[PDB]
C-alpha cells in the first residue's frame, strides 16, 4: 500500500468467515500496523492489530 487503508477497525469478526488476513508492518507511507481481513464473500474489513481476539483469530488460522 501507498498510504494507511484503515482509519477505523473492528475489535474482531466471525473467524469462520475469514478467507485471508494481510498484516502490514509500519512503513514509509503508514506509521501503524494494519490488519485487513478478506472474507469468504470477498468483503474486506480492517482489524485492530492490538486486539487480543484479532491475534487469536490469526493463531486459529495458522494452526488449521
Amino acid at each position: 500500500e501507498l498510504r494507511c487503508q484503515c482509519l477505523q477497525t473492528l475489535q474482531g469478526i466471525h473467524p469462520k468467515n475469514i478467507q485471508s488476513v494481510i498484516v502490514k508492518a509500519p512503513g514509509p507511507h503508514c506509521a501503524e500496523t494494519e490488519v485487513i481481513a478478506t472474507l469468504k464473500n470477498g468483503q474486506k474489513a480492517c482489524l485492530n492489530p492490538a486486539s487480543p481476539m484479532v491475534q487469536k483469530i490469526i493463531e486459529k488460522i495458522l494452526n488449521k
Partner: antibody, heavy 126, light 108 residues
Framework: QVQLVQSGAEVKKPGASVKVSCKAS????????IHWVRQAPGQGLEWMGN????????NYNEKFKSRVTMTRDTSTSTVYMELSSLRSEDTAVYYCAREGPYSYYPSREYYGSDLWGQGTLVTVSS | EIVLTQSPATLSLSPGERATLSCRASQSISNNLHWYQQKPGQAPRLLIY???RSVSGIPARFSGSGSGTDFTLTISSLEPEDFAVYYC?????????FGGGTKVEIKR
C-alpha cells in the same frame, strides 16, 4: 456549525518550536483523517502530514518527520501539530483539513479534502 | 514522490468563455486526483473529487475528466467569481502532492 477552528498567528525565532491546534466541531470526529498542509507566501501547497483521530497515530512527510509531531485529544476533538528546529523557510500559513468519511471497510477510492481550517500564519525570523 | 504539473500557469479569459485546465501526474495516481479553488486570503475549496465526482453545493459549470496520468478541469462558462487560482491534488499515495496552480485572470 461544521468547522475546523485553528489557533492564532505565531512569531518565532530560528531554532524555536511552534504548536498549532485545530478544533473540529459539528461532525463525527472519528470518521475523517485530519491533514496539515502549508502555504508559503505567494507559493503552492505542501503536505506536512496527517493523524488518525481514532488511533492517534500520525503520518509525516519525510521532509519534516525528524522535527514534527502531530497529536490528537479525543475529549476536545482537537488535533495539534508541533514543528521544532524552526527555520525562516517554515514561514507559511498552516492549514488543517479533513478527508473522509471512512469506516472499517477499506477502499482505494478516496474523497478529497472538503473542509479546511481558517489557517494559522507562523512567521520564523531572526 | 509524485510530481503534479499544471498547465497553463496563467489563463486570461473573458467571463462567459470556457476554461480548460490541465494536470499531469509523473506516474499513475489511479483516479485519486481532486481539484481545488483558492481566492486571496482564503483556504482552498474542494470543487471535484476522484477525477470527476460532484461535490455538494458546487455549481454545475465545473466538471472533471481524465485518462491515464492526464487530468482536466473544465469551467463551461466563466462567471466573475471564478477568476482565482486552481490546484490539483493527489492522495492515491502519501505524501499528498499538489500541482503548482493555474491562475485564471480576467481578459479586458
Amino acid at each position: 456549525q461544521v468547522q475546523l477552528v485553528q489557533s492564532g498567528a505565531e512569531v518565532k525565532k530560528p531554532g524555536a518550536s511552534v504548536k498549532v491546534s485545530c478544533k473540529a466541531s459539528g461532525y463525527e470526529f472519528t470518521s475523517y483523517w485530519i491533514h496539515w498542509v502549508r502555504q508559503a507566501p505567494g507559493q503552492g501547497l505542501e503536505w506536512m502530514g496527517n493523524i488518525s483521530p481514532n488511533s492517534g497515530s500520525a503520518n509525516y512527510n519525510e521532509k519534516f518527520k525528524s522535527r514534527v509531531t502531530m497529536t490528537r485529544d479525543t475529549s476536545t476533538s482537537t488535533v495539534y501539530m508541533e514543528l521544532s528546529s524552526l527555520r525562516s523557510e517554515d514561514t507559511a500559513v498552516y492549514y488543517c483539513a479533513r478527508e473522509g468519511p471512512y469506516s472499517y471497510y477499506p477502499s482505494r477510492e478516496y474523497y478529497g479534502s472538503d473542509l479546511w481550517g481558517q489557517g494559522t500564519l507562523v512567521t520564523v525570523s531572526s | 514522490e509524485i510530481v503534479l504539473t499544471q498547465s497553463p500557469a496563467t489563463l486570461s479569459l473573458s467571463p462567459g468563455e470556457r476554461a480548460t485546465l490541465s494536470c499531469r501526474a509523473s506516474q499513475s495516481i489511479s483516479n485519486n486526483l481532486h481539484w481545488y479553488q483558492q481566492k486571496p486570503g482564503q483556504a482552498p475549496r474542494l470543487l471535484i473529487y476522484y477525477t470527476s465526482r460532484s461535490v455538494s453545493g458546487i455549481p454545475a459549470r465545473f466538471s472533471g475528466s481524465g485518462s491515464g496520468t492526464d487530468f482536466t478541469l473544465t469551467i463551461s462558462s466563466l462567471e466573475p467569481e471564478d477568476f482565482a487560482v486552481y490546484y490539483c491534488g493527489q492522495n492515491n499515495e502519501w505524501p499528498e502532492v499538489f500541482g503548482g496552480g493555474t491562475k485564471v485572470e480576467i481578459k479586458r
